[PDB]
Symmetry: C2
Amino acid sequence: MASMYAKHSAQNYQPLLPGIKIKTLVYGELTLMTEFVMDKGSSLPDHTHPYEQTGYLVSGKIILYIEDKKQQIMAGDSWCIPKNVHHHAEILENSVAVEVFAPTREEYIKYLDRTTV
Amino acid sequence: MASMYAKHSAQNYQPLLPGIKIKTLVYGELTLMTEFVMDKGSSLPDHTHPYEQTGYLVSGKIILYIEDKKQQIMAGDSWCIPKNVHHHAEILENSVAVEVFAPTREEYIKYLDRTTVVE
Ligand SMILES: [Cu+2]
Ligand SMILES: [Cu+2]
């Protein structure tokens, strides 16, 4: 029930997968926003979570896989993945992506940058 | 029930306020994502909508007002505004912001770009 603000910082990024760093920026009662720093050559494995995922690529170049379909993602592109839909990605260059989850993905709250507000 | 993708395009931006252009990128069952292009000197007036608003500043420099708090926002900063909370902003330089609303703000679906494909 309280609003928060997060300043851009290259620190407090926690390791999630080989070449993938994660950091929860802000969250509320219905959303949660994370930032992914993905190195060239890394990938996100296939997952199905009960959270809708809408994202935005800040920089870089990735390939997003939804079901069996593939789409090349560049700076400025966006996407929206519904609940329980198979999705994975392959990172072609050093990329940065912002991802929002609905509802509040409580397992990602532990990735808070500790600063916030 | 359909996933979607939107390609970056400098077109399909509709005017919302003097100096403020809006474009709905994608939306789903619980969220809706828009992109705001804000000219230098413009501002967003005070509003209270029944939608949680979490945003990210792609570029520029603005001053975000949430309730009684004031904060200067620069590139890379983010925020989260709860439902029915007073908020407004003053745009200091040519800025671009991405904003997500929860639940799906159906009134902003009319700003959807033509370049959004399904799956
Ligand atoms: Cu996911
Ligand atoms: Cu608002």
